[PDB]
């Protein structure tokens, strides 16, 4: 099709000027056209926000009915991603709108799962995913492919959080085969590394470094690796050149703390941890916060709170961390396994 052909040539013959050429081309397409519809998903799937936003504004005041719906549904997704709205506000706007497109009906169920994943709320994510059939789509084949990759990466993160890690890798490797879009490969590799964080140190670093190379240049994608490598190395007590000492973000400060413990500077770690407790953070965050306090004080109550927050978050992978500490402090292994399952 026009868009697919355009993109495939830009990629194969001008790979290094893809954004510059596609940005210009996509912004000169007529809002009402099938190509302008394919263009909006390209911009959002590649996380080209400034472009996606210009495309949404132009296609929201459009005459084609499919082009106007796309802009309206994505407008909510862009507001949820930018942090202007709540997952429930978004869920309300989706029920209010009457979606006539089978395509903007599958995207509607995915729009919330992205906020759910970002804020440690994994509980509501798996059910929505089962309301999606990509055979209900037949007019755009560019989207069905992009939505197909989008679902595999979401399904990998869902299986990762359920401790079904063989299924997580299978769905991330499927996505890596299904696409050439950078964000999907970057998030596929990141999910594979997090799936090996306890199983195999080497394979976690190999898949995290494979993603870091693809992300290189996108500072926002790079940061996901610098954070996870930083974590991987602090858990296996290894040299960690991936720590950001300049960031105030909770998840970053948590990595500075995990290093001070590995270096046995507990007084500075507990001071920095205590200042974090007052700060706004999700339930998943607090599972890690109390795991760190337990490593400094060896208080079983801290490991218990870690277990509690991981339980709320519904994180069946990272709950293993406090569970293992409790095993080594001679807590009953059978009870620890029931809390894991």
């Amino acid at each position: 099709s026009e868009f697919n052909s355009i993109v495939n040539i830009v990629k194969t013959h001008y790979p290094d000027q893809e954004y510059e050429l596609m940005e210009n081309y996509c912004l000169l397409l007529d809002p009402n056209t099938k190509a302008a519809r394919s263009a909006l998903e390209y911009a959002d799937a590649n996380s080209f926000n400034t472009l996606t936003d210009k495309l949404v504004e132009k296609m929201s005041i459009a005459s084609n009915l499919k082009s106007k719906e796309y802009g309206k549904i994505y407008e909510i997704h862009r507001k949820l991603s930018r942090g202007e709205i709540d997952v429930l506000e978004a869920s309300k706007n989706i029920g209010k709108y009457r979606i006539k497109t089978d395509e903007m009906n599958i995207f509607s169920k995915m729009i919330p799962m992205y906020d759910y994943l970002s804020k440690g709320n994994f509980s509501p994510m798996k059910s929505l995913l089962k309301q999606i059939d990509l055979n209900d789509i037949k007019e755009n084949n560019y989207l069905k492919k992009s939505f197909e990759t989008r679902i595999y990466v979401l399904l990998s993160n869902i299986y990762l959080n359920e401790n079904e890690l063989e299924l997580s890798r299978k769905y991330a490797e499927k996505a890596i085969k299904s696409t050439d879009t950078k964000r999907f490969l970057v998030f596929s590799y990141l999910t594979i590394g997090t799936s090996y964080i306890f199983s195999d140190y080497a394979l976690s670093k190999q898949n995290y470094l494979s993603g870091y190379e693809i992300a290189k240049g996108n500072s926002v994608f790079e940061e996901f690796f610098k954070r996870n490598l930083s974590f991987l190395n602090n858990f296996w007590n290894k040299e960690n050149p991936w720590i950001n000492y300049d960031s105030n973000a909770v998840t970053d400060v948590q990595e500075v703390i995990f290093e001070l413990i590995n270096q046995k500077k507990l007084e500075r770690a507990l001071t920095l941890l205590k200042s974090l407790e007052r700060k706004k953070q999700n339930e998943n965050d607090l599972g890690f916060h109390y795991y760190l306090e337990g490593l400094i004080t060896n208080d079983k109550e801290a490991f218990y709170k870690s277990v509690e927050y991981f339980k709320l978050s519904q994180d069946k992978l990272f709950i293993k961390m406090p569970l293992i500490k409790l095993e080594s402090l001679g807590e009953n292994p059978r009870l620890l396994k029931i809390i894991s399952m």
Partner: peptide
Amino acid sequence: GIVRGA
């Protein structure tokens, strides 16, 4: 802590 994305 760890980070996730899709």
